[PDB]
């Protein structure tokens, strides 16, 4: 399948530099231009620039250029987005596509690189139990659940019982604190009738720390 | 450059159109009008290239046109799975930009019952406050449509320093959820009876309570 590979995601502080790839698979990599698109969280799609690989004629958007560089080896069927000085406001996902001359659209998008830009340092979460109580049950079912806070770079993922319990799982989106700081819940709805029987443990996966947490949550 | 609507919304079945106005060195000058799909956590996708023509896999109700200085895309037949953002994109003369993306739309399909909010509030654990932190979590679940609104209180009186919330994402059964978080000191924590939060949606309000004496 004709597919463009991206590099992994990057956390990085202000001022360091950056470069990302972008490798074309399953087709030709001169035959076709390449370009960067930046959507910075919550916003829409920017074009950055476009280069053709088979002789490095790159064309920047006015707003990036002398931002940034792109460039392309054409021998590993490789483009290049870098940066000597990276800003917070850099923080992003930048896409690769595959551009059509003349035409000029984006027929073929990879999946993206994330890159955080932050003055904070990498840190795993403290995870604490939301405990079902009276508060949390009405009728049969109640409420539990699992802060993951204070955690950075985002993603956490939250599993329950090691996958095996899916069914009322919600896990929310992440609160960004002042800190610079991640903070996230994960809540189930179980039955009442299991909370002396049942054992539910939430189990916090932070790869970008090398960190995982299992905890037990219980009747307070 | 590119005007889009920031938001179009329709029920299942029905027809809407996405309007994208430029000036007159892009579309105007009779270049031509691209499209892309962008699903929620995903890459974008092209979805109407040549103003008009579709790339294999794209279905029929999606159509493009233009006329003079704006393009609009149709979407005839929306179904669930056409709830997403919508970029046109084209090529500005003037400004040297080969390509120029549009503001963007978020489409919502309309149809589903309205549904009350299920408000669940939890106090800090004896285990954070260890730790000498106190943070109170207020999980808004099961409602439509997504906007809401949610208020902190300590013994009655509002408290604006320190809350974080969440935009209302969507949950597994296509209803919304969101969040709220209220950090206190152990010491602001222990100096109030009691703190609520309280939830606004479609005028009716829910108010949960939560107290360090529990």
């Known amino acids: 399948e004709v597919q463009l590979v991206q590099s992994g995601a990057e956390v990085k502080k202000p001022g360091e530099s950056l470069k990302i790839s972008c490798k074309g698979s399953?087709?030709?990599?001169?035959?076709?231009?390449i370009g960067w698109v930046r959507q910075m969280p919550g916003k829409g799609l920017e074009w950055m620039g476009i280069?053709?690989?088979?002789?490095?004629?790159?064309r920047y958007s006015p707003s990036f250029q002398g931002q940034v560089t792109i460039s392309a080896d054409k021998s590993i069927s490789t483009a290049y987005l870098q940066w000597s000085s990276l800003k917070a406001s850099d923080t992003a996902m930048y896409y690769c596509?595959?551009?059509?001359?003349?035409?000029?659209?984006?027929?073929?998008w990879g999946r993206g690189t994330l890159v955080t830009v932050s003055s904070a340092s990498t840190k795993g979460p403290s995870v604490f139990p939301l405990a079902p109580s009276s508060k949390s049950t009405s009728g049969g079912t109640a409420a539990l659940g699992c802060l993951v806070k204070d955690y950075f770079p985002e993603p956490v993922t939250v599993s329950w019982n090691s996958g095996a319990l899916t069914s009322g799982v919600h896990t929310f989106p992440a609160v960004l604190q002042s800190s610079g700081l991640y903070s996230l819940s994960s809540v189930v709805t179980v039955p009442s009738s299991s909370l002396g029987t049942q054992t539910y443990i939430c189990n916090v996966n932070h790869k970008p720390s090398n960190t995982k947490v299992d905890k037990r949550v219980e009747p307070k | 450059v590119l005007t889009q609507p920031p938001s179009v919304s329709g029920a299942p079945g029905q027809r809407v159109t996405i309007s994208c106005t430029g000036s007159?060195?892009?579309?105007?000058?009779?270049?031509?009008v691209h499209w892309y799909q962008q699903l929620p956590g995903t890459a974008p996708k092209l979805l109407i290239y040549?103003?008009?023509n579709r790339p294999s896999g794209v279905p029929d109700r999606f159509s493009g046109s233009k006329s003079g200085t704006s393009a609009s895309l149709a979407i005839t037949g929306l179904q669930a799975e056409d709830e997403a953002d919508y970029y046109c994109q084209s090529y500005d003369s003037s400004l040297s930009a080969l390509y120029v993306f549009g503001t963007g739309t978020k489409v919502t399909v309309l149809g589903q019952p309205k549904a009350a909010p299920s408000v669940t509030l939890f106090p800090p654990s004896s285990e954070e406050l260890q730790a000498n932190k106190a943070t109170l979590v207020c999980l808004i679940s099961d409602f439509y449509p997504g906007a809401v609104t949610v208020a902190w209180k300590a013994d009655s009186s509002p408290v604006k320093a320190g809350v974080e919330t969440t935009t209302p994402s969507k949950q597994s059964n296509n209803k919304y959820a969101a969040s709220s978080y209220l950090s206190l000191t152990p010491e602001q924590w222990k100096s109030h009876r009691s703190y609520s939060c309280q939830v606004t949606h479609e005028g009716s309000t829910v108010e949960k309570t939560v107290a360090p004496t529990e």
């Open positions: 040549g103003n008009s």
């Open positions: 007159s060195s892009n579309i105007g000058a009779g270049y031509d």
């Open positions: 399953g087709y030709s990599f001169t035959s076709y231009w």
């Open positions: 280069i053709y690989p088979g002789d490095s004629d790159t």
């Open positions: 596509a595959r551009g059509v001359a003349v035409d000029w659209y984006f027929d073929l």
